[PDB]
Amino acid sequence: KEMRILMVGLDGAGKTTVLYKLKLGEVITTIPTIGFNVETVQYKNISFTVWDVGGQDRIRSLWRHYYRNTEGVIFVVDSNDRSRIGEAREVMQRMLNEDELRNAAWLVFANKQDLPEAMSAAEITEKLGLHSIRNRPWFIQATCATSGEGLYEGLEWLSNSLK
Amino acid sequence: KEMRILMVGLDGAGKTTVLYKLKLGEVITTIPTIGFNVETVQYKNISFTVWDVGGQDRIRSLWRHYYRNTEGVIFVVDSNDRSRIGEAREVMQRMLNEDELRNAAWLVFANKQDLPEAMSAAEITEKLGLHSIRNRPWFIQATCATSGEGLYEGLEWLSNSLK
Amino acid sequence: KEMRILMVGLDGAGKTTVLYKLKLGEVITTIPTIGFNVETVQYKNISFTVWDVGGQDRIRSLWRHYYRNTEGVIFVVDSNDRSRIGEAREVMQRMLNEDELRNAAWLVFANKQDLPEAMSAAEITEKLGLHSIRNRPWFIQATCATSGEGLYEGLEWLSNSLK
Amino acid sequence: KEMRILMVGLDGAGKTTVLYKLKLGEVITTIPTIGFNVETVQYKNISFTVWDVGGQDRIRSLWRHYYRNTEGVIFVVDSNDRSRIGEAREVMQRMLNEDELRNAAWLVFANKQDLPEAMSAAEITEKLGLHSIRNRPWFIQATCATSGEGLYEGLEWLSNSLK
Amino acid sequence: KEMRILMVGLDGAGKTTVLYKLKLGEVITTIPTIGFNVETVQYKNISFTVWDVGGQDRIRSLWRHYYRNTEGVIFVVDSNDRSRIGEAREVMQRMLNEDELRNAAWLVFANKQDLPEAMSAAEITEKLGLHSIRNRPWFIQATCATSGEGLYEGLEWLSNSLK
Amino acid sequence: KEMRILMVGLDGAGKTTVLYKLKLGEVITTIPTIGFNVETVQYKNISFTVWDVGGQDRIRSLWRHYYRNTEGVIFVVDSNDRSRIGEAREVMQRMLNEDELRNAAWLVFANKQDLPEAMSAAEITEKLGLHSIRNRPWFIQATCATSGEGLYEGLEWLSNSLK
Amino acid sequence: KEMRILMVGLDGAGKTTVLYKLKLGEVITTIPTIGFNVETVQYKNISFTVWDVGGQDRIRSLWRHYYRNTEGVIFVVDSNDRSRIGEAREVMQRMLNEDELRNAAWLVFANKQDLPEAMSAAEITEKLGLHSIRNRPWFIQATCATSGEGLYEGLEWLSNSLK
Ligand SMILES: Nc1nc2c(ncn2[C@@H]2O[C@H](COP(=O)(O)OP(=O)(O)OP(O)(O)=S)[C@@H](O)[C@H]2O)c(=O)[nH]1
Ligand SMILES: Nc1nc2c(ncn2[C@@H]2O[C@H](COP(=O)(O)OP(=O)(O)OP(O)(O)=S)[C@@H](O)[C@H]2O)c(=O)[nH]1
Ligand SMILES: Nc1nc2c(ncn2[C@@H]2O[C@H](COP(=O)(O)OP(=O)(O)OP(O)(O)=S)[C@@H](O)[C@H]2O)c(=O)[nH]1
Ligand SMILES: Nc1nc2c(ncn2[C@@H]2O[C@H](COP(=O)(O)OP(=O)(O)OP(O)(O)=S)[C@@H](O)[C@H]2O)c(=O)[nH]1
Ligand SMILES: Nc1nc2c(ncn2[C@@H]2O[C@H](COP(=O)(O)OP(=O)(O)OP(O)(O)=S)[C@@H](O)[C@H]2O)c(=O)[nH]1
Ligand SMILES: Nc1nc2c(ncn2[C@@H]2O[C@H](COP(=O)(O)OP(=O)(O)OP(O)(O)=S)[C@@H](O)[C@H]2O)c(=O)[nH]1
Ligand SMILES: Nc1nc2c(ncn2[C@@H]2O[C@H](COP(=O)(O)OP(=O)(O)OP(O)(O)=S)[C@@H](O)[C@H]2O)c(=O)[nH]1
Ligand SMILES: [Mg+2]
Ligand SMILES: [Mg+2]
Ligand SMILES: [Mg+2]
Ligand SMILES: [Mg+2]
Ligand SMILES: [Mg+2]
Ligand SMILES: [Mg+2]
Ligand SMILES: [Mg+2]
Structure with a gap:
């Protein structure tokens, strides 16, 4: 609901x-997202309220204001950007250790798969150290936001962790 | 009812x-079923509410959300897939030991019997270790969902364990 | 309970x-486990609270903090590692002489039996000097944590020493 | 009751x-029974609560946890196994000397009588030294658990020692 | 008691x-028993508290610490060892002359009777000079600790000298 | 907590x-830290309250004000600075002899491992004389505060010595 | 105790x-031990309070401060050092004649048995003149403190002389 x-x-x-x-x-x-965007989207009789935030180094320190009462998290990673896959690993391993996100479900959108040099979801699953996750449900989906592929298959998985 | x-x-x-x-x-x-499907079907003046879920390795860890208040279970096994009959045995022996499914009735749909290389229901009954079940009623039926054979004979058995 | x-x-x-x-x-x-992990698992209407700890030489001296109020112990030994079976014997004979673990039940998981060079549970029972145990109940089970074999047969034995 | x-x-x-x-x-x-099974069975308006336990050499030392508040004992002996009838005699003469089972009624199921080489109940009564019992009521019945013969005639005798 | x-x-x-x-x-x-073991065993509504001690030449001089308040003594002799039956006679004739064991009951376990070269209890009764005992009750029993024979017949005799 | x-x-x-x-x-x-900084950080449901202090020669004499009620200590050593490893040894051997830090846990952050000329944690363990520690638990971890490596593995070890 | x-x-x-x-x-x-170390170790429900002292020629004259109220003594001798076995004999024969250690139990740890040139416990028993001891209980054990061998077998013997 x-x-x-x-x-x-x-x-x-x-x-x-x-x-x-x-x-x-x-x-x-x-x-560039300096502040935050918030939007409600309905699907499968469920009303997801998504909060998109900035990723600039200066706003990554303000994400903590939103951890509270958060039931799911969607970590988007650029696959073409193979030089910053370590920085994303640092950010995600830091944010997995926070106690406000202790029960949150984890979803990973490996985006920009339409690009030729894109890296597979398994290569990302290995580079991000996702199998090391043990206190949390997790899932990784390959997407293309420009074409919508794999986007409605993530909200579908997030429904598994309802209520 | x-x-x-x-x-x-x-x-x-x-x-x-x-x-x-x-x-x-x-x-x-x-x-592929990433989330879940839920549907009510009427038969013999009984309204079964079936919850179909994913079988991918990543969703097999989310089945626990549904064990509660579950009165029957239907384990579907591909008979042609004779190489994964051990993995199914592991999954079923793990899910038989859960305490939320303590009174649940067990039904087994040995599906894909229309295929020539399909394996008999007795061969499956032996490979799955079904006679080892002692705390639970159980039953195995041979099916062909494409033709409907054996499907209405499973809901008929589930009626035995009503209320 | x-x-x-x-x-x-x-x-x-x-x-x-x-x-x-x-x-x-x-x-x-x-x-590598530098600190400790703690997890509750339910089985046979019993809720085991397991504390996994580090085995590095530097953490083996911090196990004493956990001996208190411990009702069972699970000593895991790598069977393929046939060169460190003497060190494990030293550790176990030292920890059997502690007075806080005076009534604790002893279980031994001889793990990594899937490997070809693995050593039998009787060879381990002889090398570890387990028959020398007289003040304590004890049991040895052959396992394969990657496949789950022998794991639910250890918690089953630990139930014998309930309350 | x-x-x-x-x-x-x-x-x-x-x-x-x-x-x-x-x-x-x-x-x-x-x-193989590593732990224990417990089941209630009704008969003659009486609800017997039976505790089946392991017989492996490693579990024979954990039977003491169950001697307390035990009103009847059922010693099952394999008749075809004519080479271990001495070990059973040792076990039974040891467990007859325990003070927690001081008033317990003794019943002996000489099982596996369907096998051709099975040994008579009188040969077992002689080999087990059952006439030597003097502080205790006792009885021996010939059974076949696969066919149910002699099983409801043991619970019938156990009723004699009610309350 | x-x-x-x-x-x-x-x-x-x-x-x-x-x-x-x-x-x-x-x-x-x-x-080898360097120190001492102490264990309570129940039998015939009596709780025997047995103190097993070392027999090495260096510990035979520390037995005196235990003579006090000792109500029974159990001298175990290896029957196969026919070359040290004189040393045992010396030890026993020395320990029979101590005044702290003045009222103690004497029992002799002629152990290792399962061995072919074992010597009879009468040959031991003659070699140990047991009939020379006059200030003390005494008894000799033939045993096999590996099989338990003759062990519960010694505690049975020790009951004669209760209180 | x-x-x-x-x-x-x-x-x-x-x-x-x-x-x-x-x-x-x-x-x-x-x-440069002339005074002191104090900050609380949460991890594993534990709230560490860290007091960072100055290291200048003039402030090293004011550390005593903080020894009291201190449950853990974190000694940070620059690995690239191979010319002052003796001064750090002096400071640490002096501060290990204080009676207010008698039960404190010892952790050592060998920092600046990202630098090419950095010295291994074992070379530091030898130069600092850490094996000479006997009244205290201790541990050494290799870090890179600029990248966060090895920092959350120290707080993980400090949890072993909770309460 | x-x-x-x-x-x-x-x-x-x-x-x-x-x-x-x-x-x-x-x-x-x-x-090198200039002063003294003191540590309590528990074993067999007994709490030994051990005082380790210096052996340098200048501290051998300060041992007298500790003779009082001493219930056991542990003389450690290096077996590889076959050139100083006479000096140890002098020290031990001097300290056996002191009246404050009149009832003390004597234990001898012939240490460094892992070394190839080590000398047997009987050769040491002969060189130290241990059979000449008549007013005192005594015992000699072969050890290897680096491996722990023979160390828990000395505390086991010291228990014989309790209270
Ligand atoms: N070619 C291609 N471009 C994509 C794809 N997905 C997103 N983008 C493009 O990449 C650019 C960055 O996406 P954007 O959503 O603006 O970044 P952000 O996640 O919001 O992060 P920021 O706000 O801090 S800059 C945009 O131009 C966007 O259109 C894709 O699948 N293929
Ligand atoms: N030939 C044949 N195909 C069958 C039969 N039963 C089911 N299938 C087919 O096998 C395929 C898999 O069935 P499907 O229902 O999609 O898998 P699932 O049980 O839902 O599992 P999933 O959602 O995680 S992929 C489908 O193409 C389906 O049509 C059968 O009896 N014979
Ligand atoms: N091939 C095989 N590997 C196993 C088996 N059981 C455990 N392992 C593997 O062996 C490795 C070590 O297991 P692990 O659980 O991490 O060590 P530990 O007991 O926790 O000890 P540590 O934390 O101090 S490093 C792992 O890679 C694990 O996956 C097995 O049965 N077969
Ligand atoms: N042929 C035959 N087999 C029998 C009979 N009674 C029991 N069994 C069989 O003998 C086997 C052993 O019986 P089982 O009940 O499993 O042993 P247990 O008493 O529980 O002892 P355990 O659990 O420590 S292995 C089984 O295969 C069982 O089916 C009988 O009367 N005739
Ligand atoms: N073959 C056989 N061996 C026996 C018998 N009784 C005892 N033993 C064996 O003889 C050996 C010595 O027995 P043990 O109990 O260890 O000596 P002890 O009396 O305690 O004396 P110690 O502790 O100073 S070495 C053991 O290996 C034991 O198993 C017997 O009846 N038959
Ligand atoms: N290249 C590199 N620099 C580091 C690393 N860790 C810390 N530093 C850098 O070394 C410098 C000193 O660190 P700093 O934290 O300011 O000293 P301090 O421990 O507080 O001691 P002080 O306050 O008395 S000056 C800083 O410029 C810091 O950024 C590292 O791992 N690699
Ligand atoms: N190779 C070997 N070395 C041992 C053994 N036992 C003790 N040592 C080593 O011998 C050295 C001396 O031991 P140590 O305990 O320091 O002397 P001490 O008894 O205290 O006398 P001191 O304090 O007056 S210098 C140490 O380096 C110690 O590690 C052994 O069994 N084998
Ligand atoms: Mg944005
Ligand atoms: Mg599906
Ligand atoms: Mg681990
Ligand atoms: Mg059984
Ligand atoms: Mg002994
Ligand atoms: Mg600073
Ligand atoms: Mg010293």
Whole structure:
């Protein structure tokens, strides 16, 4: 009936694009997210309330204001960006150790799969150290926010962890 | 008057096909079940509420959310898949030891009997270690969800364990 | 209704893997255990509270903090490691002489039996000097945490020493 | 109205099979009993609560946890096993000298009489030294747990020693 | 209701084995007894408190610490060891002259009768000079601690000298 | 639930950087610590209260004000600084002899491992004379406060010595 | 329940190593013992309070401060040091004639048996003139403090002389 979500990731990942592809159905032009966007999207008789936030180094320290009462998390990672996959691992291993996100479900959108140099979801699952997760449910999906592929299959998995 | 059921199994078994052969009467095209499907089907003045779930390795850890208040279980096994009959045995022996499913009735749909290389229900009864069950009623039926054979004979047995 | 357990052993044995094979049902990737993990697992209407600890030489001196109020002990030994079976014997004969573990039940998981060079449970029973135990109940089981074999047969024996 | 029973014996005797032939009415497949099974069976307006335990050499030392508040004992002996009739005599003469079982009624199921090489109940009565019993009521019955013969004639005798 | 016992003898006799055959019922592996073992065993509504001690030449001089308040003595002699039957005679004739053991009852376990070269209890009664005992009750029993024969017939005789 | 920590070391080690890498997650610019910094960081349901202090020769004489009620100590040593490893040994051997830190747990952050000329944790363990510690638990971890490596593995070990 | 011990010997013997192998279980690095170390170790429900002292020629004259109220003595001798076995004999024959140690039990740890040139316990028993002891109980054990062999067999003998 209701669910709260927090979309996060590094800069350039695709968070805003994913959100406004789910909410509107169209690919909008984007500006860097200094503040935050919040939007409700309905699916399977469930109303997800997604909070997209900034990924710039200066806003990554303000994510803590949103950890509270968060039932799911969506970590978006740019697959073409193979040089920052270590920074994302640091961020995610730091945010998995926070106690406010202790029960949160973990979903990972490996975005930008339409690009030729994109890296597979298994290569990302290995590079991010996702099998090391033990206190938490987790899942990884390959997406293309510009085409909508894999986006409605993530909200479908998040439904498993309802209530 | 009412009854709750949980259809489970490995990936590729036939759970969704069975459910929407009971509910609609037609063989639908299928996509992998990331989330869950739920459907009510009426038979013998009884309204079974079936919950079909995913069998992918990543969703097999989310079945626990559904064990509660479950009055029957339907384990679907692909008979042609003779290489994964051990994995199904592991899953079933693990899920028989859970205390939330302590009184649940056990039914086993040995599906895909229309295939030439299919294995008999007795060979499956031996490979799955079903005679080892002692705290539980159990039953095994040979099916073909594409043709509907053996599907209405399972709901008929589940009626024995009403109320 | 309740029971407290302490899983211990040398480094590389399989303690964390055993624990999160009992708790989750899946084989997780692992990191060396510097601190401690604690998890409750239900079985036979009993809630075992298992404490997995480190086996590095530097943490073997901190196990004493956990001996108190411990009702069972699970000593995991790597069978393939035939060169450190003497060190494990030293550790176990030292920890059997402690007075806080005076009534504790002893279980021994001879793990890594899936490996070809693994050594039998009787060869381990001879090398560890287990028949020399006289003030204590004891038992040895052959396991494979990656496949779950022999793991639910140890918790079954620990139930004998309930209350 | 109530009665407590302890089924014991060597390994391979037929304890679990007897119990789940009385409780369910069917011959189940069996696994070695590492822990314990407990089941209530009604007969003649009496509710016997039977505790079946392991017979492996390692569990024979844990039977003492169950001697307390035990009103009847059922010693199952394999008749075909004519090479271990001395070990059973040792076990039974040891367990007859315990003070917690001081008033317990003694029943002996000489099982596996369907086998051609089976030994008579009188030959067993002589080999077990049962006439030497003087502080205790005792009785010996010839059974076949696979067919149920002689099983309901033992619970019938145990009723003599009610309250 | 209570009774205190002192098990003594030469090295290799069978004292520890006898004690932990009475207490546990199983034949344990053994290490030389440098210190002492103490165990309570119940039988015939009597709680014998047995003190097993070392027989090495260096510990035979520390037995005096235990003579006090000792109500019975159990001298174990290896029958196969026909070359040290004179040393045992010396030890026993020395310990019969002590004034702290002035009223103690004397029992002699001629152990290791299962061995082919074992010597009869009468040959031992002659070699040990047991008929020369006049200030003391005495008794000699033939045993086999590995099989338990003759062990419960010694505690039975010790009951004669209760209180 | 709570724990008090004292981070100390020579000047240039990395204490402030470690503290504000644990607390904020970012690498801050730093000024020499004339006074003291104090910060609470949560991890594993434990709230460590860390006190970072100055290492200048003039402030090393004011550390005594903080020894009281200190449950853990974190000695940070610059590995690249191979010319002051003797001064750190002097400081640590002096502060190990204080009676207010009598029960304190010892952790050693060998920091600046990202530098090419850095010295191994074993070379530091030898140069600091850490095996000479006998009245105290101790542990040494290799870190890189700029990257966060090895920092959450020290707080994990400090949890072993809780309460 | 309690016992007081004095560990003594020449320099280089192994006293400190023995003590902190009994107390901690690990082999610590060592410095010459100018003063004294004191540690309580529990075993067999007994709390031994061991006082390790220096063996340098200048501290051998301060041992007298500790002779009082000493219930046991542990003389450690280096077996590899075959050139100072006469000096140890002098020291021990001098300290056996003191009247404060008149009732003390004597134990001798012939340490460093892991070395190839080590001398047997009987050769030491002959060289030290231990059979000449007549006013005192005595015992000699072969050890290896680095491996713990023979250390828990000395505390076991010291228990014989309790109270
Ligand atoms: N070619 C391609 N571009 C994508 C895809 N997904 C997202 N993008 C594009 O990549 C750019 C960055 O996406 P954007 O949503 O603006 O970043 P962000 O996640 O919000 O992070 P920020 O707000 O801190 S800059 C955008 O131009 C967006 O259109 C994809 O699948 N393929
Ligand atoms: N030939 C044949 N195909 C069958 C039969 N029963 C089911 N199937 C087919 O096998 C395929 C898998 O069935 P499906 O229901 O989609 O898997 P699932 O049980 O839902 O598991 P999943 O959702 O995690 S992929 C489908 O193409 C389905 O049509 C059968 O009896 N014969
Ligand atoms: N091939 C095989 N590997 C096993 C088995 N059991 C455990 N392991 C593997 O051996 C490795 C060590 O297991 P692990 O649980 O991490 O050690 P530990 O007991 O926790 O000790 P540590 O934390 O101090 S490193 C792991 O890679 C684990 O997956 C087995 O039965 N077969
Ligand atoms: N042929 C035959 N088999 C019997 C009979 N009674 C029991 N059994 C069989 O003998 C085997 C052993 O019986 P079982 O009940 O499993 O041993 P147990 O008494 O429980 O002892 P355990 O659990 O320590 S292995 C089983 O395969 C069982 O089916 C009988 O009367 N005839
Ligand atoms: N073959 C055989 N061995 C026996 C018998 N009784 C005892 N033993 C064996 O003889 C050996 C010595 O017995 P043990 O109990 O250890 O000596 P002890 O009396 O305690 O004397 P010690 O502790 O000073 S070495 C053991 O290996 C034991 O198992 C017997 O009846 N037959
Ligand atoms: N290259 C590198 N620099 C590090 C590392 N860890 C800490 N530092 C850097 O070394 C410098 C000293 O660290 P700092 O935390 O300010 O010293 P301090 O421990 O607080 O001691 P002080 O306050 O008395 S000056 C800083 O510029 C810091 O950024 C590292 O791992 N690699
Ligand atoms: N190779 C070997 N070394 C041993 C053994 N036992 C003790 N030592 C070593 O011999 C050295 C001396 O031991 P130590 O305990 O320091 O002397 P001490 O008895 O305390 O006398 P001191 O304090 O007046 S210098 C140490 O380096 C110690 O590690 C052994 O069994 N084998
Ligand atoms: Mg954005
Ligand atoms: Mg499906
Ligand atoms: Mg581990
Ligand atoms: Mg059984
Ligand atoms: Mg002995
Ligand atoms: Mg600073
Ligand atoms: Mg010393």
